[PDB]
């Protein structure tokens, strides 16, 4: 079935000490998250650049990692029920806060953790280039050759277009109808590895370290080994849902050239351009497209999706 | 059928002179071992690193070869009957001892050669990326598309997780049942290339250069061209079998990221975590996971296995 | 059908001026040879090294190109009838000699051009990695999935084991029966891309620049634009056939590791070792194994072979 | 009386950050261990090299510290009753685990903590070179000049031979009788500073961080300030005792030359060689001899020993 998605977002100094902390603390956080039975997997991204749209963002490029002073992370965790996310946080708070707070020394902004419903998904399981022979054989043995997926390689061997949209109040249904029509045509582009549309349902205060006064002081005063009062989060997840309504159109690609010209198909192919124009007419903000590297991931979230 | 496995282990100086001796002496040892009709192949590994488990082994990393002062080798030889191994040694002792003793100038520890029974195997034949078209065509022609394996590339083009376990006396059956259930679920991970469980049945004294007093003096005094008395081995293979019972869980992977997150599936995927927890409850020691490169190998041992 | 094979052999200085001549003069010679309707293609090799057999040739390695002062070329041309080769030479003598003689300034030894019959061939068509999808589709459409070949990549993207043998007079039939049995078992090795057995039938004097006295003086005195008398060759092709009988066992491999351990299968796999021992018992000379790179080739010779 | 001995073993990166942690964290652990009234002292070693036995371990030497990428520590703690060790761990677990876990970033292997009974001891109190005048005066005043010991200098000013042995099941009594006879003769060697024989009785799971599944996850997930459940150790100390039986023959020496030739006395002095041959005939593994530097120690354990 479709899981819910929490996306933990932060910006950190782009230096080796940051990536060293990713290597030791990241897996620990993941292991704690997997204590909860509603956890179905994760997909952790680093932003490598920004789509320039010609020269609309003429200072951007798809790979800015060599010059950027910061690194933005977008850590997806997938949940059977959206309420499972904060339940896991509270049940494991002493571990999670002390782990996550160890990020602080490298932090410039965040964490900020919106929660999403998946309103459209066309996403395959991941496979390595070594796997496809057995995958093909099994599907033919089962009489389902149409169920043979593209090869979507895990662990940093593909790229993600992370397309931000906010929609004019009252145009949400028009946006959702047109973006699904768009993505159903976009899947013809070479190197297309899947797409999904995430619709914000709220924000996790506890995952965003957003407490009332008491917890704010405990965070600021913390030596690192004392957790803030998790009951001092003053708002529930849906209370923070934004209007204008926010969406992420998440599209995965074999490589950044396939991404650039594949996403460009909605501008370059007249038939698809007419459909995507219906998306554009509904927007307050966007499309703004971040280029992401899915580095660390628990690929079994796609098995839950496609079961 | 399932062969038995001898694993010759040693630690040597990590310098070019060591690897030059590997290139000239290694193939000779292998050719001598092939003189016995019970020899069904070999798979020789160099350890490239250690799985850090987050920062549990924080001084380790998966590839330590550029900084390590030593190199550990793990030379698997496969046998129709475990008794064939020491019979081969005795029949070819003049060649074997003089070849193996030429390693001495580079040796820091070893050799130590435990013998194992294979209690579980899910291991495919090796194939190069050039082979898969013919493999696929043949399996479909024979009506067995389910028999199409993953592409497990030979000669250093995949990586091995070598997971050491020792088990609480009386918990061997519980360990074996639980590890098989674990590996039957682990095979879903991307880039999984096979697994087997090795159960120690003893140690080859002759392969470990472990003699009584007479042979010990002959080894220490040796100019290089005189063999110690092979009848001065004081114990049989089963007499040296360890209690607590020792096992190796040997898992092969497309690459080190697939290894890291694939082996990590037993920690990150709740359903598999519950099963693997049954393994962990039985342990005296482990899991300790060495990262191995299978460089020189006689791939036909998997043909014997899968016939 | 099986073509005949002429192999033009020479040794030249290993310097850029030599390879510049290969790139400009090589194609011209090939185009002149294609003027004859019995020409069915070509496969031109540079020797990159020598198989060391452990340390039997301890000064050799599989890639010696960085240190070697010379480069050996082995240019195969394939012919419907062996007599076509020398006919082509004489019919196109003014072009061929002047092109071939332009190599002189780089020459150390040669040319020497033995002619061979193919007594065994298991050689596929070449295909690039882009081709296999269409090959598979066509073979299944034709109901012949067993005819799907391995991917044998052209133009320097595979390697050749060139194994020289000479056979004790009277043991030719034993050699031929045993080598075919050996190669039929060898094809199981990973990365095996095909094999054929070449049996010398003679030597082309004209292709070897081996004339009587008159033509020898014309060669030595030549300014470069005058051909020697092509009718001054003093022996026919079969008159120069060697006793002890000479053979080439030509085996192609995905890469040099697959070659090393694949060819080693006749030493490392007891069942195959016993068969190959029958080959070894017949030899005056060999096996001596050169490692070749098939760089420039007319791949359609395998289409003639396999029709 | 004879105390019991726990030996905490680990391997860490050989870099200054490791030794800085030894200097600051090491004393803290010792002070915590001294909270238990059964603690009678400690002797903490770094391995500086390996005895090469001629060129049997030809890649080793007695001082490898300048080239080695790792450092092995062997931390002896001495206990009135062997049960006192784990009792101390459990009673002080909050401090001990959080101190020991700070080793994490430097760790490659371990910790592994076998427990031993001392079956033979000929070990003097330590004295500095300033002390011997008063020691001599007191023993003569008491009429016991035979009780004047050698000068065994504390704090890194002597060296230890750490000789690993494992014994064929059923030969333990022969080993123990022969090694005592050997050490009673070995004490004649110049620079001999004492010897003891340690017989393994089991392994401390809590000291080895070997828990059931629950504690394993707590270790891996730890931010650094939360201890695993010390009650989740699944085996008692004797349940992990090895068969083949393991022993340490621990011999102390004025310097590494006295060590090399003194230990060599069992090979070079015919009368002693005959006795030591009876030891060698009982072995599954060994002798393997590590060269240790006893840097940090609580010398009063020898006062308990010799009272």
UniProtKB/Swiss-Prot annotation, chains A, B, C, D:
- Note the Gene3D superfamilies from the entry: 3.30.70.100
Q: Which reaction does it catalyse?
A: 4 sulfur + O2 + 4 H2O = 2 hydrogen sulfide + 2 sulfite + 6 H(+)
Asked if the Swiss-Prot or TrEMBL record annotates the protein with the keyword Iron, the reply is yes
Q: What does the record give under GO molecular function? A: metal ion binding; sulfur oxygenase/reductase activity
The entry's localization annotation reads:
Cytoplasm
What the record says about the induction of its expression is:
Aerobically induced.
Query: What's in the keyword line of the UniProt record?
Result: Cytoplasm, Iron, Metal-binding, Oxidoreductase
Q: What class of enzyme is it?
A: oxidoreductase
Can you list the GO cellular component terms from the UniProt entry?
cytoplasm
EC numbers, comma separated: 1.13.11.55
Q: What is this protein called?
A: Sulfur oxygenase/reductase
From what organism does this protein derive?
Acidianus ambivalens
């Amino acid at each position: 079935p479709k899981p819910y998605v929490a996306i933990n977002m932060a910006e950190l100094k782009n230096e080796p000490k940051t990536f060293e902390m990713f290597a030791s603390v990241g897996p620990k956080v993941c292991m704690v998250t997997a204590r909860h039975p509603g956890f179905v997997g994760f997909q952790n991204h680093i932003q490598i650049g920004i789509l320039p749209f010609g020269n609309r963002y003429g200072g951007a490029k798809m790979d800015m990692t060599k010059e950027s002073s910061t690194v933005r992370v977008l850590q997806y965790t997938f949940w059977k029920d959206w309420k499972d996310h904060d339940e896991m946080h509270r049940q494991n708070w002493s571990y999670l806060f002390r782990l996550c707070y160890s990020c602080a020394s490298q932090m410039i902004w965040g964490p900020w953790e919106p929660i999403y419903e998946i309103i459209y998904a066309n996403m395959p399981i991941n496979t390595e280039m070594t796997d496809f022979t057995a995958v093909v054989g099994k599907k033919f043995a089962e009489g389902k050759p149409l169920d043979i997926p593209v090869i979507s390689q895990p662990y940093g061997k593909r790229v993600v277009a992370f397309a931000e949209h906010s929609v004019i109040p009252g145009k949400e249904k028009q946006f959702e109808d047109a973006i699904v029509r768009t993505l159903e045509m976009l899947k013809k582009a070479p190197g297309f590895l899947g797409a999904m549309v995430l619709k914000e349902i709220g924000v996790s205060g506890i995952g965003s370290m957003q407490f009332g006064a008491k917890g704010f002081h405990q965070v600021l005063e913390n030596p690192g080994s004392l957790e803030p009062d998790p009951n001092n989060v003053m708002y529930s997840v849906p209370e923070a849902k934004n209007t204008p309504q926010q969406y992420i159109v998440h599209v995965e690609w074999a490589n950044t050239d396939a991404l650039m010209f594949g996403m460009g198909r909605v501008l370059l192919y007249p038939e698809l351009r007419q459909v995507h124009d219906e998306v554009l007419d509904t927007l307050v903000y966007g499309p703004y497209i971040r280029i992401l590297n899915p580095m660390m991931e628990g690929t079994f979230w796609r098995e839950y999706l496609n079961e």
